[PDB]
Ligand binder design. Sequence first.
Ligand code: Y01
Ligand code: Y01
Ligand code: Y01
Ligand code: Y01
Ligand code: Y01
Ligand code: Y01
Ligand code: Y01
Ligand code: Y01
Ligand code: Y01
Ligand code: Y01
Ligand code: A1AIA
Lengths: 96, 1061, 71
Amino acid sequence: NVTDLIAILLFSVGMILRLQDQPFRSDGRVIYCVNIIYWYIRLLDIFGVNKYLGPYVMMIGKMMIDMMYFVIIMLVVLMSFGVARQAILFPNEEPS
Amino acid sequence: SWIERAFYKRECVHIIPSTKDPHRCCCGRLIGQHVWSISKHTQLSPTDAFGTIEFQGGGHSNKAMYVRVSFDTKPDLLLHLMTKEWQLELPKLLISVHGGLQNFELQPKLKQVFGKGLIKAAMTTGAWIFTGGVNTGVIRHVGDALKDHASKSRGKICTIGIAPWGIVENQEDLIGRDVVRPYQTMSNPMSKLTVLNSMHSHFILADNGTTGKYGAEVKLRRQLEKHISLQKINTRIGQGVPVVALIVEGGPNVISIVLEYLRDTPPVPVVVCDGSGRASDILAFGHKYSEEGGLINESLRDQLLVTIQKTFTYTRTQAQHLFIILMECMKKKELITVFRMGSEGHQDIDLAILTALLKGANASAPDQLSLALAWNRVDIARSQIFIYGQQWPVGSLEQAMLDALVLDRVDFVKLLIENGVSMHRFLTISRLEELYNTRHGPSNTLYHLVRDVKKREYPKGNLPPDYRISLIDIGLVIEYLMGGAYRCNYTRKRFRTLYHNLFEINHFPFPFHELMVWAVLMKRQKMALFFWQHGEEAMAKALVACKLCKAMAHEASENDMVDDISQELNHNSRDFGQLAVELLDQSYKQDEQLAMKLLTYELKNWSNATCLQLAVAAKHRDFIAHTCSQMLLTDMWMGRLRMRKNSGLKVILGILLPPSILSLEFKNKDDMPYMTQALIPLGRKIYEFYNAPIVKFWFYTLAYIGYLMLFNYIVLVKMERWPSTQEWIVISYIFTLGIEKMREILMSEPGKLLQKVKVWLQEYWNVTDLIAILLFSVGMILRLQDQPFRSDGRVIYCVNIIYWYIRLLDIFGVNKYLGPYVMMIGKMMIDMMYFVIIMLVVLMSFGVARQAILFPNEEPSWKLAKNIFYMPYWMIYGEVFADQIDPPCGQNEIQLPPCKTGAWIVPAIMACYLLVANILLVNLLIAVFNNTFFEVKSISNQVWKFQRYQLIMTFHERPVLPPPLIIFSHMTMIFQHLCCRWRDYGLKLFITDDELKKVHDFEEQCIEEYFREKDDRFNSSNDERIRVTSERVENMSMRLEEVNEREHSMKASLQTVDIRL
Amino acid sequence: ITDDELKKVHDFEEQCIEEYFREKDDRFNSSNDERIRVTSERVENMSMRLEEVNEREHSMKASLQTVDIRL
Ligand SMILES: CC(C)CCC[C@@H](C)[C@H]1CC[C@H]2[C@@H]3CC=C4C[C@@H](OC(=O)CCC(=O)O)CC[C@]4(C)[C@H]3CC[C@]12C
Ligand SMILES: CC(C)CCC[C@@H](C)[C@H]1CC[C@H]2[C@@H]3CC=C4C[C@@H](OC(=O)CCC(=O)O)CC[C@]4(C)[C@H]3CC[C@]12C
Ligand SMILES: CC(C)CCC[C@@H](C)[C@H]1CC[C@H]2[C@@H]3CC=C4C[C@@H](OC(=O)CCC(=O)O)CC[C@]4(C)[C@H]3CC[C@]12C
Ligand SMILES: CC(C)CCC[C@@H](C)[C@H]1CC[C@H]2[C@@H]3CC=C4C[C@@H](OC(=O)CCC(=O)O)CC[C@]4(C)[C@H]3CC[C@]12C
Ligand SMILES: CC(C)CCC[C@@H](C)[C@H]1CC[C@H]2[C@@H]3CC=C4C[C@@H](OC(=O)CCC(=O)O)CC[C@]4(C)[C@H]3CC[C@]12C
Ligand SMILES: CC(C)CCC[C@@H](C)[C@H]1CC[C@H]2[C@@H]3CC=C4C[C@@H](OC(=O)CCC(=O)O)CC[C@]4(C)[C@H]3CC[C@]12C
Ligand SMILES: CC(C)CCC[C@@H](C)[C@H]1CC[C@H]2[C@@H]3CC=C4C[C@@H](OC(=O)CCC(=O)O)CC[C@]4(C)[C@H]3CC[C@]12C
Ligand SMILES: CC(C)CCC[C@@H](C)[C@H]1CC[C@H]2[C@@H]3CC=C4C[C@@H](OC(=O)CCC(=O)O)CC[C@]4(C)[C@H]3CC[C@]12C
Ligand SMILES: CC(C)CCC[C@@H](C)[C@H]1CC[C@H]2[C@@H]3CC=C4C[C@@H](OC(=O)CCC(=O)O)CC[C@]4(C)[C@H]3CC[C@]12C
Ligand SMILES: CC(C)CCC[C@@H](C)[C@H]1CC[C@H]2[C@@H]3CC=C4C[C@@H](OC(=O)CCC(=O)O)CC[C@]4(C)[C@H]3CC[C@]12C
Ligand SMILES: CCC1(c2ccccc2)C(=O)NCNC1=O
């Protein structure tokens, strides 16, 4: 319900931006697409009523914590390789 | 409101005679407390004190109904009150407990034994206990016994106490009309009035008008006991309910009560107890020292006189009068049963009570047997009624057998069968019809089944209430519940001819079969398990009972009945299935070949079926997955071939190179002839080889794998205007296979076409087959036209090639490892579908967001919906489309197109989508597949082992020739059908009579082994041994303590003897 | 619900409470551990009081021997 109200405030911001002229209309459109992402996940919660889909959804929510720890370890290894590759292959770079 | 309008009461309206105390009237109440006709002048009125009593305090809370009644009321009305308003059934036994009104204490062992006896006697026979009501003396001991009863037994012992209304404390507390009135169990010691006993069940509190005086209830209680004893018991053999009179202690009046009981028509037995004292002890001292009843000599006469004058403290003439009343009692010495603590006094209250009832009835042994049947006491019947030398009337034992059967008494049927009654000489058609029309015992759903089959047979409706269910209707019920082509013996023409001509020819050859079916139909599980043990064809009976219980459970669930009935019927079905499995285990352990002969022989008493067919028709997965049934199915699979070494290759060599058949080792002519309906050696070998199920399956498989290549050739190479030779072969294969599938629709098990189609559509691989033959017909019709329809027919041909490769997967289903693998895949499709649903939500969210950001100015077109699903779906399988993740734009490298607004969001939500999909959901489906692998694997193995039978029966019923040449065999069947018109699906054995007797004797040996082994395993378990040791140690400690008391007494006697000498 | 239905519900609840408690007492009394403990305590009490029975049997045998010697 609080994610619902956050995505209604976001829709209000997107509508207020869209009802003006350019370049704010495209910004309102960009907000509309993030809203469509949220409403598909709200459809996942609506699937939560079914006797098999519901436990599946909270099972996914339980494995998010293990996913986060995997993300942390992958983040350390990923920036180590990325910084090493970018720092070797591009020696003369300006701050950007 | 009936209770007030039917019962009356009396209140003290007198002249207030003072006598001794001026406040105390003739009724004893206070002189200002007012508001028989002799000196009390009482008036009659409707009652105002009746309802329910909530006993507050005294430990356990117990609710007791109560009425205040007049002492002169007719006992029939009160009997109607107990039977109707209090909802109490007529008891099988009446107990009248009498004793001293003064409080007394007994020995602890005597009190414990008397309490346990009175509780068990009221519990097993379902008796009524009649006490004095108030919580004094013997009724207080009965109340302590009932307190112990509510501490270790789930009985609601009906213990109606009758007390004077004027003597119970707090008379104003019990005033109401159907009103729950609380009561106090506390008793003031200063008040002469006593409270009621706390844990009685009902109260017949009787008012004569007076208060604080007794005598208002004795005549009413005696008349009510007489009126109950005049009522006939439910056995209807010609006897009323038995009445016993238990006496503990007592005073002067209980001797007169014993005289009234003994000198009565009919006489009432009296059971007394020893060790309490007073009148019971003088009765015991008279009874031991009696000689020939009233023949009592002078010395014990004077001893009885001095003990009466001492213990009761009376004069000489009062003791002489009491001794005269004692001798008048003792003239009827046979009725009085004396219980003695310890010694040889039956060591129990209840053996004394029930033996006293049996010889107080003094009737024939049928009457005693019907009394024991009503009391549900098999043990007393065995130890008294069936003693040695007992004379039995002719035909009475079979009547008792019928009465025991209709009342659902397992142990009485066991006792009667062990005592000479035989089922073959007893069970007739009329007796079985009476058993099928009984109304006693537990409830059943047979009447619903009879109503349904009567509605289906004659579309009437509800049956009349006075409907006698014939055996033909029972046969229709069995035919409906069994299903398929089952035909009960009742509905055959021989039985209908015997029924019309009669309503040892009427006796059943296998009476335990009919008793098993009747016990299963009316849901009497213990009697069904007893009837399973006795008789032949045990495994067939178990499988038939399993299918019948499952079908009755399904019908009870379908008719919206009580769900507990359906659960109990499913439990009965599972118990019978477990019995059949254990019998198969025992038969496999003893002899393998005789177990095969047991499994395959035709059951003439069960519609010519087979034990394997009965197990398959009951979906018994554990029966067919057993090793004996599996290797039996393997023997059915090879046909008339020994072989059994390097399978597959030898029959493929036989099919491809037919001279290899002659070198194959064939089976004997009568080794195991599984048949359906009951140069020359070279032709016999060829016919025996080509009709084997494994040979037919490999011929059909090698034709399938030569059809699939031809289909591949015609779809890969181009086609001209007319089809080539290989396409004509493929078209011929499809048409002959379609004709074969219609022939499987026609030659099915049911009789009406819609049922044939409905049975055929359970095999999903056949309806998918027919769908892909209709699709081929559509594709051929489109292809035989000109362009552009020819390419459409080609496009349909490729979807057909996809289906036929999956049909090859089902053909791999025959192999012992590939088959369970295929159904394992089919089980994981559901988890795959749920993963598809979650992936679909995440996939369209990313696709819609990406397409809506990167393409702002778009017209309505169906390419948007394609672009939603196109690239995010291939993003899962290692193709991220790296050139389109974030192309450079808004710069000059040639002028690039300008940057779309918010186009930087697309790689970020791409990152979140790829992470969630590829890492979360795929690994979660890995975990789902992994943690449900073991159960699915075991279930798939067992289901494949079950479906081996369906595969074997299908490929044995198939034509010999493969589908591209099956039109010759189809014309052969058409010509044979036309010849038979112009002029039994299974594989049985059809053994002879001596082989049948050998098989039956093997089955009885297996049944005895299985049951007894189970008894030996139960008796040798740790739990049963520990329980037996604990019970023996308890009995040993308490009787051993009695040995110690006797050892102390013997040491005292030896010390006195040594002191004397 | 009404008052008669309330009384029926309350009586059903008391029946369920008695069933649950007593069933628990029956399950406790029929367990292997409680049976083994009761058997061991009864056997101990029986051995020690039985040893007292033996001492009294020796005394009674001595008294019977003395009485036989006297007569
Ligand atoms: C288009 C792109 C950006 C993909 C979107 C990815 C995420 C924004 C989504 C994908 C799956 C979603 C998850 C799917 C399942 C659940 C469980 C559900 O939570 C519960 O049911 C509460 C109980 C529990 O957490 O166990 C809702 C949140 C959560 C973590 C969701 C949070 C948002 C997630 C990570
Ligand atoms: C360890 C794992 C589980 C998480 C770490 C990965 C993300 C934090 C990275 C991977 C891809 C990255 C994105 C790749 C490309 C872009 C586009 C970039 O925008 C531009 O460069 C502007 C347009 C242009 O110049 O072409 C802004 C950052 C962003 C969204 C990046 C944000 C950070 C992301 C999502
Ligand atoms: C940029 C590229 C070159 C990637 C770098 C790869 C390796 C140099 C890193 C990646 C993960 C590292 C490992 C992550 C975790 C551990 C456990 C940790 O060891 C302990 O905590 C000691 C106890 C134990 O070994 O169980 C430190 C070493 C080790 C093996 C690390 C050794 C170095 C590894 C293999
Ligand atoms: C332990 C781990 C998580 C540390 C990872 C740190 C880096 C990812 C961060 C920290 C410092 C950052 C730098 C801090 C300062 C700058 C200067 C900045 O220059 C400008 O914005 C241009 C200045 C101007 O012209 O106004 C460009 C990004 C950069 C290189 C940042 C790039 C990203 C860096 C290396
Ligand atoms: C029993 C099972 C395991 C195998 C039985 C199937 C094969 C013996 C069949 C199925 C596909 C057939 C092929 C399908 C198509 C052709 C093309 C055909 O060539 C032509 O029609 C044009 C040239 C010519 O006329 O010879 C020659 C036969 C051949 C190779 C066939 C040879 C026999 C094959 C391999
Ligand atoms: C029963 C089916 C399902 C499997 C049995 C396989 C064989 C009996 C079939 C399969 C492919 C057939 C072949 C497919 C094509 C040809 C080409 C055909 O060539 C011609 O007729 C040449 C002259 C012309 O083009 O008319 C001769 C028969 C032959 C060898 C066929 C012979 C019979 C074969 C080997
Ligand atoms: C060329 C492309 C289109 C690939 C084709 C994909 C599907 C059309 C196929 C691939 C695997 C097939 C499955 C493989 C295994 C089985 C088990 C089998 O079912 C049984 O044996 C019944 C018992 C059970 O379902 O457990 C046949 C259906 C099914 C689900 C199949 C259904 C059709 C599937 C999904
Ligand atoms: C969540 C997962 C498990 C299932 C969702 C994926 C499918 C439903 C999608 C992914 C790829 C899609 C296909 C991608 C491309 C096409 C071609 C398209 O045909 C054309 O565009 C015509 C030819 C042309 O214009 O080039 C028709 C839809 C179809 C089959 C799409 C149908 C829907 C598909 C199978
Ligand atoms: C909860 C989830 C499953 C919802 C997903 C819905 C979308 C995938 C569907 C629903 C509405 C559909 C739209 C409904 C109407 C049109 C107009 C249609 O326009 C035409 O056919 C052209 C009209 C003409 O010229 O005749 C093109 C497809 C499109 C955009 C559809 C594209 C697919 C949409 C967005
Ligand atoms: C619910 C799960 C278990 C199954 C997945 C079902 C849907 C996700 C599939 C099935 C039917 C599919 C549709 C079948 C046909 C089309 C037409 C297709 O149209 C074109 O490609 C037009 C040609 C072009 O302009 O490129 C676009 C995809 C779409 C809507 C498909 C979108 C995805 C759908 C809805
Ligand atoms: C079409 C496949 C097949 C077949 C072949 C081998 C094994 C199982 C099934 C057949 O060729 N004719 C009978 N029924 C069939 O579906």
